[PDB]
Structure 1
Amino acid sequence: GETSVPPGSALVGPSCVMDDFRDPQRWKECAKQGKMPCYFDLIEENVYLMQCECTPLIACGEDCLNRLLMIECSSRCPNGDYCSNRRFQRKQHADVEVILTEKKGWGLRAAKDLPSNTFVLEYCGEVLDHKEFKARVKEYARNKNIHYYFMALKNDEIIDATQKGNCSRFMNHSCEPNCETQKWTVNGQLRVGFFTTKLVPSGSELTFDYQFQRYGKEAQKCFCGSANCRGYLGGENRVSIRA
């Protein structure tokens, strides 16, 4: 039939917003109605189980000697409060929104245009040793978990955001992604964040190469929709020249 501009429709009860992730009561109410994802413990930093030469004034921009090595500045930075290279410490996350996708579950989208190499969010979670990781892999498999939330931090430490983390846990995989992980040193401690790799326009889903699953043994259908989607996610090996 002929289509027309719909009338204005205000909702019957009040809608769910990103601040409601810091309001357990309202999140749990919204979640019951399918307007928010399942509850998890929102954390501000991971749970465990260098002075630049910039002249005091963009403060600590692209030429900052700390930034170039993926090291954040300290409070002692020559630019003090105005230092732009304390993004993890100041939780200077991008304007993001959580979305419900047709096939992948929940996801994240950009609420403003994000330039290339913009910090999106820290990937926070429980930092697991190999023993605990192996125990949880078996636990989650037996429980038939639909989604996975592991990310390697270093060779002996894996971050698990299944139970505790932030909205970065909702990031989906794409075969042609628009974000990547970067591992930054913040007061001597390695942390991992998502950063854009191109200009991401407002309203676009934020995606990454989910290496943990991509190079794992088992596979699943990939719903990324990208022009050159590899078809499935998992069961892949990195390039090697054998024998």
Structure 2
Amino acid sequence: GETSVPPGSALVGPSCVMDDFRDPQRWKECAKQGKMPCYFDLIEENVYLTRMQCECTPLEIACGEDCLNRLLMIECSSRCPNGDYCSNRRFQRKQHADVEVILTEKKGWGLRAAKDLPSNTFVLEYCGEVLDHKEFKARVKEYARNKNIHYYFMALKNDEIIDATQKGNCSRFMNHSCEPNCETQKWTVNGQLRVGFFTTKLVPSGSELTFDYQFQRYGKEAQKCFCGSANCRGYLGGENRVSIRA
């Protein structure tokens, strides 16, 4: 039939907002109604189970692209020459991009840009429980036995795996794309390695934020990939990195 501009529609039961992730009672209400994802423990920094001073002239960006710390993926300290105005303390100040959580047709929940994000914009820290090999192997078996639909593991370093299944932040919702618009970067903050999502191109407002989910991509089992990209590899998992054998 003939289509028309719809009338203005207001909700009656108030809509769920991003600040409701810091409000457990409202979140659990919204989740029952399917207006928010299943509850998890929102954490501000990683939970463990088991010097560097730039030459930036005090200030049009304070500790911009030429900052000797930034160049090595090291954050500045409170002693930075630019003091409070240092732009290279993003993890410490939790200077996350403007993001919104969305419900996708096929992949579950996801993350979208709420503003245009330039290339190499800090999106969010990937926070979770930091697991040793033993705990990781146990939880892999635990999650497999429970038939978990989604995975939230990310390697931090060769002996440490972040698990955001139970505890983390909204970065846990990031979905895989075969042609992604974000990457992870591992930054040193007060001597401790932390991992965050960063855009790899200009991401326009309203676009889903996506990454190459390496943990699953190179794992043994596979699943249908719903990324929709022009050169989608068809499935996620069961792949090996390039090698030249024999």
**Band of TM-score, shorter chain:** over 0.9
Separation in 2 of the partners of 1:79 and 1:226? 42
State the 1:202 CA deviation: 0.2
State the 1:172 CA deviation: 0.0
SS in 1 for 2:184: strand
Separation in 2 of the partners of 1:59 and 1:14? 41
Separation in 2 of the partners of 1:194 and 1:26? 27
State the 1:27 CA deviation: 0.1
Separation in 2 of the partners of 1:142 and 1:126? 20
One of 56, 59, 74 as aligned partner of 2:58:
56
Separation in 2 of the partners of 1:98 and 1:225? 19
Which residue of 1 is the match for residue 101 of structure 2? 98
Which residue of 2 is the match for residue 146 of structure 1? 149
SS in 1 for 2:102: strand
SS in 2 for 1:89: helix
State the 1:12 CA deviation: 1.5
SS in 2 for 1:140: helix
Separation in 2 of the partners of 1:14 and 1:234? 40
Separation in 2 of the partners of 1:219 and 1:13? 40
SS in 2 for 1:88: helix
State the 1:108 CA deviation: 0.2
What is the CA deviation profile of residues 185-237 of structure 1, one whole-angstrom value per residue up to 9, with x for unaligned ones?
A: 00000000000000000000000000000000000000000000000000000
Separation in 1 of the partners of 2:121 and 2:100? 16
1:106-117 map, 5 Å: 106-117=109-120
State the 1:13 CA deviation: 1.1
Contiguous gaps of at least 5 residues in structure 1: none
Separation in 2 of the partners of 1:237 and 1:192? 23
TM-score after normalising by structure 1: 1.00
Separation in 2 of the partners of 1:68 and 1:107? 30
What is the CA deviation profile of residues 145-169 of structure 1, one whole-angstrom value per residue up to 9, with x for unaligned ones?
A: 0000000000000000000000000
TM-score after normalising by structure 2: 0.99
What is the CA deviation profile of residues 34-92 of structure 1, one whole-angstrom value per residue up to 9, with x for unaligned ones?
A: 00000000000000000000011110000000000000000000000000000000000
Separation in 2 of the partners of 1:154 and 1:8? 51
How many percent identity over aligned positions?
Answer: 100
Q: Which runs of 4+ in 1 moved over 2 A?
A: none
State the 1:96 CA deviation: 0.0
State the 1:16 CA deviation: 0.1
Separation in 1 of the partners of 2:62 and 2:19? 30
Contiguous gaps of at least 5 residues in structure 2: none
Which residue of 2 is the match for residue 39 of structure 1? 39
Aligned CA-pair RMSD: 0.2
Separation in 1 of the partners of 2:114 and 2:55? 35
